[PDB]
Amino acid sequence: MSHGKQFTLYTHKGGPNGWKVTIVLEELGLTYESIFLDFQKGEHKAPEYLKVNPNGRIPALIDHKNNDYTVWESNAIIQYLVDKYDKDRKVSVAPGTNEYYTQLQWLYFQASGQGPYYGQAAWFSVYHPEKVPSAIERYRNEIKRVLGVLESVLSKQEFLVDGKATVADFSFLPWNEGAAKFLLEGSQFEEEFPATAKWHKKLLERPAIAKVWEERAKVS
Amino acid sequence: MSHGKQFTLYTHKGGPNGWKVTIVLEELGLTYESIFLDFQKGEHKAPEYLKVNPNGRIPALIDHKNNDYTVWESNAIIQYLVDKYDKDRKVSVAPGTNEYYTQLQWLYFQASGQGPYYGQAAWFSVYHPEKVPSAIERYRNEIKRVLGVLESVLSKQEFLVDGKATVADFSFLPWNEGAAKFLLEGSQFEEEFPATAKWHKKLLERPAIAKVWEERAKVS
Ligand SMILES: N[C@@H](CCC(=O)N[C@@H](CSSC[C@H](NC(=O)CC[C@H](N)C(=O)O)C(=O)NCC(=O)O)C(=O)NCC(=O)O)C(=O)O
Ligand SMILES: N[C@@H](CCC(=O)N[C@@H](CSSC[C@H](NC(=O)CC[C@H](N)C(=O)O)C(=O)NCC(=O)O)C(=O)NCC(=O)O)C(=O)O
Fold first, then answer.
1. Which residues contact B52 (CB under 8 A, 6 or more apart)?
2. Which has the closest alpha carbon to B3: B49, B48, B35, B28?
3. What is the C-alpha separation between A38 and A27, in angstroms, rounded?
4. Ligand positioned closest to the Cα atom of A122
5. B149 contacts in A (CB within 8 Å)?
6. What distance in angstroms lies between residue B57's CA and the mean position of ligand 2's atoms?
7. Backbone phi, then psi, for A187, in 5-degree steps?
8. In angstroms, rounded to a whole number, what is the distance separating the alpha carbons of residues A40 and A62?
9. Is-same-fold flag (A1-91; A92-220)?
10. Could you tell me the end-to-end alpha-carbon distance of chain A, in angstroms, rounded to an integer?
């Protein structure tokens, strides 16, 4: 491609799910061009992009070193990336093992248990055209539930897929940061979910991830 | 195990996500004992089950032919099952191929784009302690959007992962059936999403799936 990096990444300056992918890209030392879409201008619903993802959401990924193979859904992308490009197993477990499917389990918990429900909280709190306290409450409570699920595990073992930091852990970061900052009361995160918070903060301190967060902060 | 089948499946008579797994089990000709949990009696939140899934939801899977390896999240289970036990690739594509990650993409779209949002529709329509038309509307519309995404693809190609029915296709069945019957206006499904509906109805006509649906109907 013209930008000359291995990957095109369709993403967004603010939402968590593009940064979710970016984290793994950086961890794997891969090169990528971030294409930031403007939702306000409906760029995610435009014909050109719908070609890339007919869901018209971000993120999506094009691998210019693989016959411009294109894939979307953040955790699908992430699976592609570690499987193909983490053969040394820095931040992932091997395909074709029991552990792989525990890894996958946690990725699915992330993509279907954390993201969607956190996002409903996001929506109703700020962006819903009327305030609905019952709806707000519902999804506030679910955030707490999900966090409690994580706490129940992380208090007993260091990482989700026991033994080592993996993408399974990384995948939770952007949504959990959102919640820590704007969906929960300040200090509720540290107080109520001490294990999870430690696990989260330490991960953000990985050099690669810290790098990405810096960039995140910049396009704030 | 005492029930003497290869798998234990923790599931529920009514919800879609247990039947989602059951479909694949039957397609693969595997043996399993279905353990139906009673939500009304909080059996999904009880200590014994939380051991199996600390998320305290169904489904979850124990493979008594694999050192009672246990895994949860419907599409994680499903990935385990086809990867390990579909080596002949009846209803799945091979690990370590480009197609695998398009398969995975669609599974993630199912688990995070269809299930959660359909479920919010389910919740607000019937079970939310107050009626909120804006919330109802939101998730009704999202059902339509998701269906429109499927229609945009399925009108152009026979199956999601082009060439052959796969678990990617199967995974959509239970939620889409729910919507067809109770979340949309009758005949809205056939009229507004003609490609998707055909794809859905034909799948339900696969011998294995039709079998499962019969059983579904029985525990109605
Ligand atoms: N499952 C997908 C989620 C993709 C996704 O949500 N991407 C967002 C950017 S992160 S922004 C987070 C996002 N919120 C939104 O997108 C808010 C707008 C939306 N139309 C709505 O009405 O809810 C959300 O809650 N997602 C749930 C989740 O993460 O599982 C997007 O493109 N939004 C444009 C749009 O949809 O209009 C993935 O992980 O890749
Ligand atoms: N992502 C998981 C979803 C697991 C799931 O939702 N299982 C349901 C049975 S299907 S029933 C469908 C389910 N609804 C519910 O579970 C309704 C009760 C819930 N506590 C609530 O307040 O929403 C739903 O909407 N799910 C969203 C989705 O499919 O992605 C369950 O155990 N419910 C008990 C409970 O949570 O209390 C998977 O695919 O395995």
1. B10, B60, B62, B70, B72
2. B35
3. 26
4. 1
5. 54-56
6. 6
7. 85, -5
8. 24
9. no
10. 27
Rounded to whole angstroms, the Cα distance separating B177 from B175 reads 5
Dihedral-angle region of residue B29 (phi above 0 means left; psi in -120 to 50 means alpha; beta otherwise): left
d(CA B45, CA B48): 9
Method used to obtain the model: X-ray
Check if B195 contacts A (Cβ < 8 Å): no
A109 closest CA partner among B109, B114, B105, B111 = B111
Which among A139, A169, A171 is positioned nearest to A157, based on CA atoms? A169
- The CB-side HSE value for B163 (13 A sphere, CA atoms) comes to 8
Name the architecture of domain A1-91: 3-Layer(aba) Sandwich (3.40)
Cβ(A174) – ligand 1 distance below 6 Å = no
Q: Does domain A92-220 have CATH number 1.20.1050.10?
A: yes
Beta-carbon contacts of residue B91 (< 8 Å; ≥ 6 apart):
B24, B27, B28, B82, B165, B166, B167, B170
Q: To one decimal place, what's the resolution in Å?
A: 2.0
Cross-strand bridge partners of residue B7:
B32, B63
The closest of B94, B74, B45, B220 to A104, measured between CA atoms, is B74
**From the CB of residue A96, how many other CB atoms can be counted at a distance below 10 Å?**
12
List C-alpha distances in Å: A36 to A25, A32, A44, A57, B105.
16, 12, 10, 12, 21
CB B111 less than 6 A from any atom of ligand 2: yes
Number of CB pairs, chain A paired with chain B, less than 8 A apart = 102
Cα distance between residue A175 and residue A97, in whole Å: 28
CB A24 within 8 A of CB A78: yes
Q: Where are the beta strands (DSSP E) in B27-178?
A: 32-36, 60-63, 69-72
Tell me whether residues A54 and B152 touch, CB distance under 8 A.
yes
Sign of the four-CA dihedral A115, A49, B165, A104: negative
Residue of B nearest to A117 (CA): B116
Tell me whether residues A132 and B135 touch, CB distance under 8 A: yes
Contacts of B115 (CB under 8 A, 6+ apart): A112, B16, B17, B175
Count of beta carbons in the 10 Å neighbourhood of residue A53: 21
A186 vs A183: CA distance, rounded Å: 9
Strands A32-36 and A7-11: parallel
Contact of A195 with chain B, judged by CB distance below 8 Å, is answered with: no
Q: Where are the domains of chain A?
A: 1-91, 92-220
> Exposed (0-12), middle (13-18) or buried (19+): which is A126, by Cβ within 10 Å?
exposed
